[PDB]
Amino acid sequence: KVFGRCELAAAMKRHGLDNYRGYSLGNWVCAAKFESNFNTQATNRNTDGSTDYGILQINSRWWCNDGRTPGSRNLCNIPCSALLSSDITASVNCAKKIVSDGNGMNAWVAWRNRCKGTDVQAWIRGCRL
Numbered sequence: 001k002v003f004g005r006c007e008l009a010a011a012m013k014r015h016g017l018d019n020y021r022g023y024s025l026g027n028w029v030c031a032a033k034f035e036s037n038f039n040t041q042a043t044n045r046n047t048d049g050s051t052d053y054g055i056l057q058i059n060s061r062w063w064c065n066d067g068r069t070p071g072s073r074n075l076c077n078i079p080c081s082a083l084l085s086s087d088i089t090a091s092v093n094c095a096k097k098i099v100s101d102g103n104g105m106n107a108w109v110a111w112r113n114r115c116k117g118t119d120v121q122a123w124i125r126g127c128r129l
Protein backbone atom coordinates (compact mmCIF):
# COMPACT_ATOMS: atom_id res chain seq x y z
CA LYS A 1 0.00 0.00 0.00
CA VAL A 2 1.12 3.49 -0.90
CA PHE A 3 -0.27 5.69 1.85
CA GLY A 4 -1.32 9.26 1.32
CA ARG A 5 0.46 11.75 3.58
CA CYS A 6 -2.51 12.61 5.82
CA GLU A 7 -3.70 8.99 5.60
CA LEU A 8 -0.42 7.84 7.11
CA ALA A 9 -0.43 10.65 9.69
CA ALA A 10 -3.85 9.53 10.96
CA ALA A 11 -2.76 5.89 11.18
CA MET A 12 0.41 6.75 13.06
CA LYS A 13 -1.54 8.97 15.47
CA ARG A 14 -4.17 6.30 16.04
CA HIS A 15 -1.37 3.87 16.90
CA GLY A 16 0.17 6.27 19.41
CA LEU A 17 3.25 7.60 17.64
CA ASP A 18 2.39 11.32 18.04
CA ASN A 19 4.79 12.49 20.75
CA TYR A 20 6.10 8.95 21.34
CA ARG A 21 9.46 9.36 23.09
CA GLY A 22 8.82 13.10 22.60
CA TYR A 23 8.76 12.95 18.79
CA SER A 24 5.88 14.86 17.20
CA LEU A 25 3.77 13.32 14.45
CA GLY A 26 5.50 15.34 11.70
CA ASN A 27 8.83 13.70 12.58
CA TRP A 28 7.38 10.23 11.98
CA VAL A 29 5.62 11.22 8.74
CA CYS A 30 8.82 12.89 7.52
CA ALA A 31 10.87 9.77 8.35
CA ALA A 32 8.38 7.57 6.49
CA LYS A 33 8.45 9.86 3.44
CA PHE A 34 12.22 9.62 3.10
CA GLU A 35 12.55 6.01 4.20
CA SER A 36 9.83 4.49 2.01
CA ASN A 37 7.95 7.23 0.12
CA PHE A 38 4.97 5.99 2.18
CA ASN A 39 5.06 2.54 0.53
CA THR A 40 4.45 -0.36 2.96
CA GLN A 41 6.08 -2.76 0.50
CA ALA A 42 9.46 -1.00 0.25
CA THR A 43 12.52 -3.20 0.81
CA ASN A 44 16.16 -2.07 0.46
CA ARG A 45 19.32 -4.14 0.94
CA ASN A 46 22.03 -2.64 3.13
CA THR A 47 25.76 -2.99 2.43
CA ASP A 48 26.22 -5.16 5.54
CA GLY A 49 23.78 -7.69 3.99
CA SER A 50 20.83 -6.91 6.22
CA THR A 51 17.66 -5.52 4.62
CA ASP A 52 15.34 -2.67 5.58
CA TYR A 53 11.60 -3.35 5.43
CA GLY A 54 8.37 -1.40 5.19
CA ILE A 55 7.13 2.10 5.80
CA LEU A 56 9.86 2.86 8.35
CA GLN A 57 12.62 0.69 6.78
CA ILE A 58 13.15 -1.45 9.87
CA ASN A 59 16.41 -3.39 9.64
CA SER A 60 16.90 -7.15 9.84
CA ARG A 61 20.29 -6.89 11.60
CA TRP A 62 18.54 -6.12 14.90
CA TRP A 63 14.79 -5.95 14.71
CA CYS A 64 13.04 -8.52 12.53
CA ASN A 65 13.86 -11.95 11.14
CA ASP A 66 14.35 -12.47 7.42
CA GLY A 67 16.41 -15.67 7.63
CA ARG A 68 19.28 -14.26 5.56
CA THR A 69 21.06 -11.86 7.93
CA PRO A 70 23.78 -13.88 9.70
CA GLY A 71 24.40 -12.88 13.28
CA SER A 72 20.99 -11.26 13.51
CA ARG A 73 18.73 -10.46 16.35
CA ASN A 74 14.97 -10.22 16.01
CA LEU A 75 14.21 -7.82 18.86
CA CYS A 76 10.65 -7.05 17.69
CA ASN A 77 10.04 -10.78 17.45
CA ILE A 78 8.41 -10.58 14.01
CA PRO A 79 9.13 -11.95 10.54
CA CYS A 80 10.40 -9.01 8.42
CA SER A 81 7.64 -9.79 5.87
CA ALA A 82 5.06 -8.73 8.52
CA LEU A 83 6.47 -5.20 8.25
CA LEU A 84 5.26 -4.97 4.62
CA SER A 85 1.57 -5.29 5.36
CA SER A 86 -1.06 -2.71 4.47
CA ASP A 87 -1.85 -2.52 8.22
CA ILE A 88 1.02 -0.60 9.89
CA THR A 89 0.50 -2.05 13.38
CA ALA A 90 3.63 -4.24 13.40
CA SER A 91 5.85 -1.52 11.99
CA VAL A 92 4.62 0.95 14.61
CA ASN A 93 5.05 -1.49 17.52
CA CYS A 94 8.58 -2.23 16.32
CA ALA A 95 9.38 1.46 15.70
CA LYS A 96 8.46 2.21 19.34
CA LYS A 97 11.13 -0.27 20.46
CA ILE A 98 13.71 1.17 18.05
CA VAL A 99 13.15 4.79 19.15
CA SER A 100 13.42 3.71 22.79
CA ASP A 101 16.85 2.06 22.28
CA GLY A 102 18.98 5.08 23.26
CA ASN A 103 19.50 7.34 20.29
CA GLY A 104 15.90 8.34 19.63
CA MET A 105 15.04 8.90 15.99
CA ASN A 106 18.73 9.08 14.97
CA ALA A 107 18.31 5.32 14.47
CA TRP A 108 16.75 6.29 11.12
CA VAL A 109 19.65 7.79 9.13
CA ALA A 110 17.21 9.47 6.70
CA TRP A 111 15.45 11.13 9.64
CA ARG A 112 18.76 12.49 10.95
CA ASN A 113 19.90 13.68 7.54
CA ARG A 114 16.62 15.02 6.11
CA CYS A 115 14.13 15.61 8.90
CA LYS A 116 16.00 16.44 12.10
CA GLY A 117 15.83 20.17 12.82
CA THR A 118 13.55 20.97 9.89
CA ASP A 119 9.99 22.28 9.92
CA VAL A 120 8.47 18.78 10.38
CA GLN A 121 5.00 20.17 11.16
CA ALA A 122 4.75 20.86 7.39
CA TRP A 123 4.25 17.08 6.99
CA ILE A 124 0.89 17.16 8.83
CA ARG A 125 -0.25 20.47 7.31
CA GLY A 126 -3.84 20.36 6.10
CA CYS A 127 -4.58 17.02 7.74
CA ARG A 128 -7.82 16.64 9.67
CA LEU A 129 -6.30 14.57 12.45
Ligand SMILES: [Cl-]
Binding pocket: 024, 025, 026, 027, 120, 121, 122, 124
Ligand atom coordinates in the same frame (compact mmCIF):
# COMPACT_ATOMS: atom_id res chain seq x y z
CL1 LIG B 1 4.66 17.88 13.97
Ligand SMILES: [Cl-]
Binding pocket: 021, 022, 103, 104, 105
Ligand atom coordinates in the same frame (compact mmCIF):
# COMPACT_ATOMS: atom_id res chain seq x y z
CL1 LIG C 1 15.37 11.68 22.12
